[PDB]
Structure formats: structure tokens, C-alpha cells
Symmetry: C6
Subunit: 176 residues, 6 copies
């Protein structure tokens, strides 16, 4: 891939005691894109052949995999970014009803993804072994995970990023 190949005329800088946010926020935008693609198919890209189930039950790997991973972290992120992406191309150029409502959209989205995330991954963690007692899964069986530490780390990162994103997003939203 390659994303962004024309940014040369940016001599105009800020002078006020504000609009520091847009710097921080474009930086976090670009950042999160890199951070994503660089580790995109490269942490969670694997986790299909990595959910070993101690059994001889047919299918129970698939069963428990959806049971505990309806969706992977990186998708909720990918979405979180895209919904939080549309205000970016908006704020690309501003001076001359929406504009600040773009800022607010950007806030509330990111908030939503945080909440529903912690609803799903309660404990902000990756259990080393998830058991499973699904229908075909004849009793409570065991179902492993690879690299739970890893995924936990990058999750801590992205959530911290979400917090700072919103804090400057809102710190300039709160101009009154």
C-alpha cells in the first residue's frame, strides 16, 4: 500500500493559544493508520489456526471461536477509526452547522467503541485458556489462545490513544 503522497504547502502555522489539538489529532490520525497497517494482519491476522481445543469434538474449535471471539479486536478498531475518520477529511481545511458537530461526532463515536469494547472484553485482557461448553462441545472443554499477552499490549495502546484523541478533541470542543 501507500497512503498520502501530496503534502508540501503547509507553511502556515498556528499562532493562537489554541488549535494545538488539530496538530495532535492529525498526528494521531496518521499514527493510528501506520500503527494499524504495520501490525494489521500481523497480530490478529493469524488467529484462526491458533485456538487449539483439547477435544475430539468435530467443529468445536469453530464453535468456541465464535463463542468467545464473535469479532476480533482489530475490526472494532478498524471501524472505530473509520467512523472517527470522516471528520478528518472535513477538518482538512476550515477557515471562511457541521464543523463543530464533526468534532462532537468524533468524540462520541470513540466513546461508544470504548464502552461496547469493555462490555465484550471485560477485564481489558486476553485469557490464556478459555474453556467452552457449547452444544457440540460435549462437556466443558478447553480452548487455547496464542499470544494473549501481545494482543493485550496493543489493546492497552489503542485504548490509551482513544483517551487522548477524545481529550484534545473535546478540549478544543469546549471552547465556549
Amino acid at each position: 500500500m501507500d497512503w498520502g503522497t501530496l503534502q508540501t504547502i503547509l507553511g502556515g502555522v498556528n499562532k493562537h493559544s489554541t488549535s494545538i489539538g488539530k496538530i495532535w489529532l492529525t498526528v494521531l490520525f496518521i499514527f493510528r493508520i501506520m500503527i494499524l497497517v504495520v501490525a494489521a494482519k500481523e497480530v490478529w491476522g493469524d488467529e484462526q489456526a491458533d485456538f487449539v481445543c483439547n477435544t475430539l469434538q468435530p467443529g468445536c474449535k469453530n464453535v468456541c471461536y465464535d463463542h468467545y471471539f464473535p469479532i476480533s479486536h482489530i475490526r472494532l478498531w478498524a471501524l472505530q477509526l473509520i467512523f472517527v475518520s470522516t471528520p478528518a477529511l472535513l477538518v482538512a481545511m476550515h477557515v471562511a452547522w457541521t464543523y463543530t458537530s464533526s468534532i462532537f461526532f468524533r468524540v462520541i463515536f470513540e466513546a461508544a467503541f470504548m464502552y461496547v469494547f469493555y462490555v465484550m472484553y471485560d477485564g481489558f485482557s486476553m485469557q490464556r485458556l478459555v474453556k467452552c461448553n457449547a452444544w457440540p462441545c460435549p462437556n466443558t472443554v478447553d480452548c487455547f489462545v496464542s499470544r494473549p499477552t501481545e494482543k493485550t499490549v496493543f489493546t492497552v495502546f489503542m485504548i490509551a490513544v482513544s483517551g487522548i484523541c477524545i481529550l484534545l478533541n473535546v478540549t478544543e470542543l469546549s471552547y465556549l
Copy 2:
């Protein structure tokens, strides 16, 4: 990949009490492209090695796989987009027989994909286990699925998107 690298001169905005749709609709277009590619080969990209059949019948996985998945969701989407894509490059620039018939085409296509979809995936769902009683499949056998929840989610999304696409598509088609 990278799609779209020249859009700078768009200072001209709308002033009437209409043409809000074209904003919404170009946004939904770009959106659905991202939404697609980001999760393109990344939800349904897997589902070949993910249709476990409890048996010892040769081939019965392939048999039942085509039996229940003639085609995957994402293809019907891919098509739905492309047939609904041609009016986009048309409406790229408009002011000066087709033009509104492009709008109507865009409506009726998306409608068609909705209908035939629900004909095929009746119940707007992903069954956790599809049985199968095909010729080689000696009796009614079991044939699993992975991530049925996941696919169900993104299907709910794309169908909602279809509804809103058409509603603004038609809301401006209905100018009289």
C-alpha cells in the same frame, strides 16, 4: 491498494433546500468502499477451511458448502456496489434522458439485491450448524460454520446502508 488521490477543488457547496442527498450518497459510496476493503478478505475471505463436516464422507464438505453457500455474502455485496457504482461516476458532475434515470437505476438495483438476498439468506442470519443430506453425504450429516455471529453483524450493517442509500436516492428522485 489506494483509490482516489485527487480531490481538492470542491469549494462550491450547495445552497438550496436539496442536494443534501449527493453529499450523503457520495459519503455512503466512499464509506462502503472502505468498509468493504477493510473487512473484505477478512471476514468471508477465510470461509473455505471453516465448514467442518462431522463425517467420514469424501467431498461432503465441498458438497454441502456449495449446497448452503452457492455464493458468499460479500460477492452479492461486491456486485450490488458495482451495479450501484456506475451512477456515481455519472453524478460526479451534472449541471448544464439519463441523469435522473441513473438515480432510478441506482434505486432499483439495490432493491433487487435486497430481495434476492433475503430469498437466499432467509431469516437475515447465520446458522451455527447446518446439517446436510446430499447424495454423497450419506445420511443427514452435520456441517459447521465459523464466526456466524460476525457475518450476521456485517450483513445487518450493509442492509441498513442499502436502506438509507435508497431512501435519500429516492427522496431526491421524488422531486416532481
Copy 3:
């Protein structure tokens, strides 16, 4: 991949009661490229590990695979496109012996691929089970297929596309 990243100066449109074809035909060209790459290695890309032969004969999968699939559909297509591709870059710009003979080439190629296709895939179909009685294949054995429905669908599409390609190709070839 990415194909085509410079098309901006196309303000000049047609005014006659003809040259509608070139619109349709460039559209079908671009279309078929997308249609291809999007589903390229994604329907027939699999079909090597998908030709289960009920036997214990060594090699009989390979034997019968070539026996019934000398070549896959998508190759005959790929070729069909490429031979039908050279007139495209020709007709890129036209006004000022070949020019109409390019049109005729484009016709007759596509016709040829249709005929030889139906010679090979007689019945415009994908049999769910092909038997096989090759030399090593000790008796008439069974040899399965995956997703025969799928491949049948996309074949119906590409052949319909061929028909319309030629019909406008020739409708403007028939100017007299």
C-alpha cells in the same frame, strides 16, 4: 494491485446518434477487470485441493483433475479478455486500415472463446460429481467438486457479458 490512476480530462462527450457503444464497451472493459480481480483467485483460485476422489488409487486425483479440467474457466476468460484487450488501448483515442478491423477482431475473438468454451463445458454447467476411469484410476471411480453452483453462476455472468460486448461492438461495426 491498482490499475488506472489518470483519467481527468474527459469533458468532451458524444452528440451523434451513435458512439454509445464506446461508452458501454469501456465500461464493460473496466467492469470485467474489476469483476475478474475481485473474484479472480477467489472462486477458481482454490480448486486444486477441492477435487476429492473416492479411491485409494495414487495420483488419480491429479489424473482425473486434468482429465476433466485441462484448464479452468478463469484462464479461458483471462485470455478472452487479453485478446479482446488490445483493441481497447487502440480505441483510447481515434479522431483524425486498422481502426474498424480492431472492432472486428474484438468481435471474432470473443465469439471464438464462446464456441470453444461450450465445446469443452458442454451444458453450460458444473457437475456435482464427475466419475473417472483413467488408466491408474482402477475402475470407474468418483471424483468430487466444490462450489459447482458458484462457478456456474459466474460463468453465466461472463457469457452474458460476452454477448452484450459483441452486440454493441457489432452494432457500431455495422454502420455501413
Copy 4:
């Protein structure tokens, strides 16, 4: 990929009773590039997991694979093209010691690849089963191939292309 995205100013055409070759030859160049990439990793791209050896000898697949396929067809082609590629960018623009020697280089290379090819693939063919009696391969064993017909076809094509390449290459080399 994408190769070639700037060719617009070519209004100047030929008027003599020659230089038809450069048309044919640039066309064959572009052609062979397409023809290659389209079927590049798509006929011979597979043939690693496709050389079944009826045995229980360890390694004998690798052994016999190198034994009968030191190198695949498509590499000899890839090279054949590249060595025959350098005169192309040379002849990109010509009018104002090398120039005709570029033409001759282009001839003799393509000739060489033809000869050494037929030295290696004697019979211009793909045997359905190659036996093998290598050291570890304990007796004469059997070692299969997939799609030998296919590869034979595309080989017939590329060799015919080589013949016509040289014939026009030389027909204009023979100007005296």
C-alpha cells in the same frame, strides 16, 4: 501492480513501407507482459504441492522435483523477456553503433532461449507421469504432475510469440 501510466502524445504515425515491426514489437512486448502477469503466479505459481510421488521415501518429491524441474518454464520466460526487454526502452525514441545492434541482441537472445528450452523440455511437452530412480528414491518410483496439458498450451503460445517476435525483429533488421 500497474505498469505504464503515461502514453498520450503518439499522434505521429509511420508513412514509409517499413517500421511496421516497431508497432508489432511494442504490441508483443506489452502483450507478453500482460499475458505473463495475468497467468504469472497462476499456472506455474502452484507447482510445489503438485508433484505427488507414489512412495514412502522421505524427500523423494523434492529430489525428483529438482531432477525433472531444475527450473520452471515461467522463469526461462521471465528471463527471456528481460534480456529481450532492454532493447525496448532503447527503441522508445530513435530518430536523430548500438541502435541496430540492439535489434540483433533482441534476435539472438530469444533464439538462445528457444534452443536451450527445447534442450531441456524435449518434445515441447508435459508428461503426465515422470518416474524417478534418484539415490534416496529407492527404486524407479512414480512422480505425478498436475495440469500438464495447461502448461503445454501456454508454452506453445510463448514459443509461437518468440517466432513472430524474431521474424519481424529480423525482417526490419534485414533492411540492407
Copy 5:
């Protein structure tokens, strides 16, 4: 991929007895990008199917893999680069609070990645066999590695690069 396709107007060179660093540092930047992508998914890209565990314990490969590889080297690098990347696009053009603090950021990051690295890979090495005594891993079991020498080599390289990066980074930071 392709990164960087517009750098032509650089006739202005340095004349002082300093700013040699920016040459060295842009070179190391570009370098490390190449060095990365060229060997990116090509040394550590494999190491999922390469951690053989002498056992019959289910999952113990995944268990011990995360146990000893929470994260691979190349990720810590990828990050190290990206955090050390933002000052680069800053120092792209300079003459006319941040500017030198960008230099200092660039220092301290790279330092941090060095330290935490050696915390994790103590001994600046790749053990040929890591044992493992995890919960499911019933006793102390054995768990192999592939190419430990290789990875050790490229690690020695990247750490040396870090040292020189910082030494010139700081040698020009230390201007007083």
C-alpha cells in the same frame, strides 16, 4: 509497495562544520525503511509454524510461544522506527519550542526501545531450544526455534543502527 517518489530539488548542500548529522540521519531513516521491508515478512514473518514443541500436550506450542515470545523483535523495531519517525517529517525543512525537542524525542525513544529490548531479550540472543513448563505444558517440555542465528544477526544490526542514530542525533543536539 513504493515509498518516496518525489525528491529532485536538493541542490542546496551544507557548508558549515555541522549538519552532517541530518545527512547521516535521513540516510539511516531511508536505510532502515528498506532494511525493514526487504526483510520484513521474511525473517520473523514465518515464526508461527516454527516453534516445534516436543510433547503431546494440546496448545502447548501456543502457550510457550507467547510465554517466550510475547512479541517478536520486528514489532518492537516497527514501533521504535515509528516513534522515531515523527521528527523526520518535521526536520524535512527547518530554516526560518519544538524543533530541537524533536531531536531530543528522537534520542530518548530509541534509548527506551534499546533498554526494554535488552530487558526482554537478555543476552542479545536467540536460544536454539527454549524449554517450557507452563500449566497445560505438563512438565518442563522442549520448544524449538528456527533460524535463531539469523534473527540474532539482524538484531545486532538494528541495535548498532540505533547506537549510531543516537550518536549523531545527539552530537548535533549537543551544539550548545
Copy 6:
């Protein structure tokens, strides 16, 4: 990929009885890039699943693989090119301490890679079977290779290329 898409203004040619080298050397540069990428992940790209070890020792494939292949040929090449790459972008434009020292760097690097190579692959060859007597590898075991002939061929090529690279590199370095 695609590398190099702007080279049009090169009407200025050489007239002296020298600077033939820069032609040869840019050609060899471009060449080696093509030669690489075309066969890059396509000869040595495989050799992970291709090192069959006649045993029942766990891990002994990995063990002996690193034992005999610390690093693959194509990496030593990749490096050899990159270290020999920096003088290229330097010599892109020259007329108006480094310049000739770039030439000398280019020499001595390529020399180094030759020497250390032959230190490692002594005999300029690919043994059809490497035995192995590592710790876990319980006795002297056997460990196979695929396509040793192939790799030998392309190695002969790249080393010859190195020789000619240096000979013209130095023939113009030796101007006095």
C-alpha cells in the same frame, strides 16, 4: 510493486572515451532489481517446507535448517545490493571528497559479499542431501533440499554479475 516511473529527459549522451561504465552500471542496477523481484519470493521464497529430515526427531528440521542455512542466499544478495545501492542515487547526477569514494565503496562492499559468501557456501553449490548430527538430532540424520540445481544456477548468475559490476566500477575508478 512498481519502481521507477519518471525517466524522460536523458537526451544528453556521453562523448568521451569513458563513462561507458555508468551506462553498464545503471543497467546492472535496474537489471539486478528486476532479476531479484521477478525471482525474489519465487526460488528461495519456498524453502521452509522443503528441508525434509529423515527422522522422527522433534524439531530436527528446524535445528538442521539453521545449522546449514543460517541465512538464505537471497538475503545476502538483498543486502549486497542495498549496501551497493547508496552510490547509485549518488551518481544519479554528478557534474559541477565523496564522489569517487562512492565508487570505491561500491567496489569493496561487493567484494566483501563475495568473500563471506564463499566462506559460507564453500564449493559454489547446493548439496542434494545434507546430513545432520545436531544435539536433538539423535545420530547423524539425513536432511533433504529441494531445487538445489535451481539455486545453484541463480547463484552463478549473481556472482558473475558481481564480477562485472566491480570490473567496470573499478575500470572507471582506475582513471588516474
